[PDB]
RNA sequence: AGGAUCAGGAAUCGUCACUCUUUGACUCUUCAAAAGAGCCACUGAAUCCAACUUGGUUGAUGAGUCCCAUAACCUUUGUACCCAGUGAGAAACCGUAUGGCGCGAUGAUCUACCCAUGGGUGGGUACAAAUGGCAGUCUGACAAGU
């Protein structure tokens, strides 16, 4: 416990009169240290479509996918850029599967698996739609939910299809994989998120999450609380460990396009022109219920921790850097990294992921993970069963 | 009982550098062109002539010192060799009872042609040497900067 060398950043009001959420990002960029203040990027690439964002599980490479033709893998911290592909088919998402050397893009029809340089490795005959393209490196399993009812699991270690699960739910409106559990979460128009394992052809458990369609879903690091948003201007705080929505934030001004969860407990809600993050909102009490406005400054009622409004955009998606305190918000013209104080964890474990990794360390670690892949039957509702 | 498909056999390392090779990108680029998201304007840079400046036939520029003119390769004139080696063969007595260089392995013996073992011609090989060949003592008018 005392070996833990680095401690989180904080944000403190210092008055009741002074307010926490009112800080702006140019105002933040004054006091943050120079490399960390400079780690906020403004990539306005206004020519192509709205931009999809994903950092790798280590923050070392950023992958972006504009809706029209852009596919871009930068070695994000440095000036290096690996991939810049212009496919005139339209794309939806992308993820690095194992390392920055191999990634996968979610196109109009077919998923593509791709080299760092931008070369074509593997076009999938299957995956005939691809809306959410997500990965779990602990099974080496690219799990993809298109606009189809089905859900496809490709084991890119072997390079073969594991399984394909028809939901009977229709087009997938959301998918968030569980880091702690590797159960997949699919969200559809009935207000229903289904938990999934590749073995079980019926879902593990269905959840009538909200009314209307599922806008998005996002899961804790601990796998305890998953924050779900419907298109009904509502966001539920599901505690998966006992399958209860802790708080039901009703009547947003606009339904959130996405939700995202940091490591230390931050929650990101992006209505699209606005991005708003709460601190410690996932806890058990309804005092920790995330609320927009606490009248009278009552400590029980909970205000948002950090706010932002995008002027000329309706942003697409967002994702924290997993070890740093920023979050990449993909807007129509591009990418902002909005600086949080305490979102990411300060003390990573190198033996799990390496944010500072040599290429020789990388090819050691890749072989280490491929030795430690699990075959797909081990995806279960509990890791420990 | 012997062989080939799905126990007679070394290989369990959380990488640091260094070098080498390899392919790929890359600014370019020849094969060798051809096509040009086209037009204005603003502004910048570069080049070329004119111009001007400074320096210059009291010499500006151009220039394969070293690959050695300090030579190479010969050519003629004076010497050392060999078709150093050969190695057992060369010449017929003795001061005042007694004493020896009287050879010689530890070396006796020699150093392709004609002429009765006297002399040399011819070729290869090496050097000294050349005021010998091969092998005939630079340019000279712009340059450079804006």
Curated annotation (Swiss-Prot):
Protein name listed in UniProt: U3 small nucleolar RNA-associated protein 7
Alphabetic keyword roster: Nucleus, Repeat, Ribonucleoprotein, Ribosome biogenesis, rRNA processing, WD repeat
WD repeats: from-to residues: 45-86, 167-206, 209-248, 251-288
Miscellaneous field: Present with 5800 molecules/cell in log phase SD medium.
Record note on quaternary structure: Interacts with snoRNA U3. Interacts with MPP10. Component of the ribosomal small subunit (SSU) processome composed of at least 40 protein subunits and snoRNA U3.
GO cellular component: 90S preribosome; nucleolus; nucleoplasm; preribosome, small subunit precursor; small-subunit processome
GO annotation (BP), single: endonucleolytic cleavage in ITS1 to separate SSU-rRNA from 5.8S rRNA and LSU-rRNA from tricistronic rRNA transcript (SSU-rRNA, 5.8S rRNA, LSU-rRNA)
Major subcellular site: nucleus
Name of the gene encoding the protein in the UniProt record: UTP7
Function description: Involved in nucleolar processing of pre-18S ribosomal RNA.
Record organism: Saccharomyces cerevisiae (strain ATCC 204508 / S288c) (Baker's yeast)
Residue ranges of the TM segments: none
Subcellular location: Nucleus, Nucleolus
First-to-last residue of the parent protein present: 64 to 448 of 554
């Amino acid at each position: 416990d005392y070996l833990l060398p680095e401690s989180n950043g904080y944000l403190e009001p210092e008055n009741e009169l002074e307010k926490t959420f009112k800080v702006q990002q140019s105002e933040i960029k004054s006091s943050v240290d120079v490399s960390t203040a400079n780690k906020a990027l403004d990539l306005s690439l206004k020519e192509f479509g709205p931009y999809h964002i994903k950092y790798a599980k280590n923050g070392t490479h950023l992958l972006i996918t504009g809706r029209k033709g852009h596919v871009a893998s930068m070695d994000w911290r440095k000036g290096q850029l690996r991939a810049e592909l212009f496919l005139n088919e339209t794309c939806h998402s992308a993820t690095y599967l194992q390392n920055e050397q191999y990634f996968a893009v979610a196109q109009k029809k077919y998923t593509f698996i791709y080299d760092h340089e931008g070369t074509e490795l593997h076009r999938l005959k299957q995956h005939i739609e691809a809306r959410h393209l997500d990965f779990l490196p602990y099974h080496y399993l690219l799990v993809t939910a298109g606009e189809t009812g089905w859900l496809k699991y490709h084991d890119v270690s072997t390079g073969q299809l594991v399984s394909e699960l028809r939901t009977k739910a229709g087009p997938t409106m959301a998918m968030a994989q569980n880091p702690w559990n590797a159960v997949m979460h699919l969200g559809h128009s009935n207000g229903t998120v289904s938990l999934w394992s590749p073995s079980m052809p019926e879902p593990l458990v269905k959840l009538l999450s909200a009314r209307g369609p599922v806008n998005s879903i996002a899961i804790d690091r601990s796998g305890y609380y998953m924050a779900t948003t419907g298109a009904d201007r509502s966001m539920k705080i599901w505690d998966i460990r006992n399958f209860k929505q802790l708080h039901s934030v009703e009547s947003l001004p606009t339904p959130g396009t996405n939700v995202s969860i940091s490591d230390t407990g931050l929650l990101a809600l992006s209505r699209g022109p606005h991005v708003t993050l709460w601190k410690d909102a996932l806890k058990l009490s309804g005092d920790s219920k995330p609320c927009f406005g606490s009248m009278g400054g009552n400590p029980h009622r909970n205000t948002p921790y950090m706010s932002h409004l995008f002027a000329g955009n309706k942003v697409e998606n967002l994702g924290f850097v997993p070890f740093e305190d920023l979050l990449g918000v993909g807007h129509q013209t591009g990418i902002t990294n909005l600086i949080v104080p305490g979102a990411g964890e300060a003390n990573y474990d190198a033996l799990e992921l390496n944010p500072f990794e040599t290429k020789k360390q990388r090819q050691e670690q890749e072989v280490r993970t491929l030795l430690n892949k699990l075959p797909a039957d081990t995806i279960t509702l509990d890791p420990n069963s």
